[PDB]
């Protein structure tokens, strides 16, 4: 009776066993069909040239339930090599996940995979737990969506959650944009993968945007070279920080939305006055798109400008931020005190799928 932990993201699945310190499998959240009859995860990616890819999770939400079932089946049987009917399964969901979506996940786990028990946790909350906290505000930026999730004593506060429809995939696309201004042409799906590697390796958040652009314009001290797979070597400059600057200025890609520093402040300002200090002192970064060097310092600067002068602002950026959601789930699911909170098959059978709201919050 060992529990499984599955963290389903728009871009990557992280799956493993509760009590482990790392997920056993990390693979793209993709289903490919020929351009057998379908391929999932790491097959479908290494075999990409002969496949058309579909992403069942978009913008943090499951949009294709048939292909999401394939991802789950592939997670259980191919990657983890377990029979789901023998294991309690902890799943994760985005903040403000629609009611009908959570019920559909629950129904599938119980009626299709016949799990003995399951639980649905909000990803941001698991990241807060992984950092040793039960109170704080989480900035979760992944591949498809970015959220500010204030959390007080294990309860995410849905009225104060902020959502920015901008994350790693958009930043990759934006870096493809602006690299063309330097004269480089990255168009194909394989070239997108290269630009994503450029972003993950060379990009950073400037502490002050205008100063950094002036530095980049008057010298080459911020330029960095990158070897393409074919051996050719390109040089990138102010794109290093112009790409993630979009998080703070979404209008760079034409979004009429406030940047992540302002949404953090507004989310705090929608919480009870009583708890705001604890939120300001516990700003936890999570997700792959918060990995940029310098993002913590910039958030500290920008929130200090918005918050009252006496407030203490701390930004926590743990080193395993790509995996904090999974680690938090591994911790939670393996706690002795957690076990009464699994939804059991009997409770599901007696209440219907609406049991997930009663028990997961």
């Amino acid at each position: 009776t060992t529990a499984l932990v599955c963290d389903n993201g728009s871009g990557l699945v992280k799956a493993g066993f509760a009590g482990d310190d790392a997920p056993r499998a990390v693979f793209p959240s993709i289903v490919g069909r020929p351009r057998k009859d379908s391929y999932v995860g790491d097959e479908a990616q290494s075999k990409r040239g002969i496949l058309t890819l579909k992403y069942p999770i978009e913008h943090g939400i499951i949009t294709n339930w048939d292909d999401m079932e394939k991802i789950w089946h592939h997670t259980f049987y191919n990657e983890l090599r377990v029979a789901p009917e023998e294991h309690p399964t902890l799943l994760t969901e985005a903040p403000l996940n629609p009611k009908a979506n959570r019920e559909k996940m629950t129904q599938i786990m119980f009626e299709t995979f016949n799990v003995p028990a399951m639980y649905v946790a909000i990803q941001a909350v698991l990241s807060l737990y992984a950092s040793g906290r039960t109170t704080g505000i989480v900035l979760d930026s992944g591949d498809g969506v970015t959220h500010n999730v204030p959390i007080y004593e294990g309860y995410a506060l849905p009225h104060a959650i902020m959502r920015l429809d901008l994350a790693g995939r958009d930043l990759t696309d934006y870096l493809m944009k602006i690299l063309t201004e330097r004269g480089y042409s990255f168009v194909t799906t394989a070239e997108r993968e290269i630009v994503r590697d450029i972003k993950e390796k060379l990009c950073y958040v400037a502490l002050d945007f205008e100063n950094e652009m002036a530095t980049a314009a008057s010298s080459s001290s911020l330029e960095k070279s990158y070897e393409l797979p074919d051996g050719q070597v390109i040089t990138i400059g102010n794109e290093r920080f112009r790409c993630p600057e979009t998080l703070f200025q979404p209008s760079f890609i034409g979004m009429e939305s406030a940047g992540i520093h302002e949404t953090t402040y507004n989310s705090i300002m929608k919480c009870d006055i009583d708890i705001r200090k604890d939120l300001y002192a516990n700003n936890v970064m999570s997700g792959g798109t918060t990995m940029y060097p310098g993002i913590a310092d910039r958030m500290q600067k920008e929130i200090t400008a918005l918050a009252p002068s006496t407030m203490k602002i701390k930004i926590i950026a743990p080193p395993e931020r790509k995996y904090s959601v999974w680690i938090g789930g591994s911790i939670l699911a393996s706690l002795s005190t957690f076990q009464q909170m699994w939804i059991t098959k009997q409770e599901y059978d007696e209440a219907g799928p609406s049991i997930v709201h009663r028990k997961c919050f």
Partner: peptide, 22 residues
Amino acid sequence: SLHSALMEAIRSSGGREKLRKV
């Protein structure tokens, strides 16, 4: 309260060492 015992466990259980290396 059952929630608080879980929250207390999350903060001070020591779970993060207790995770097996894999």
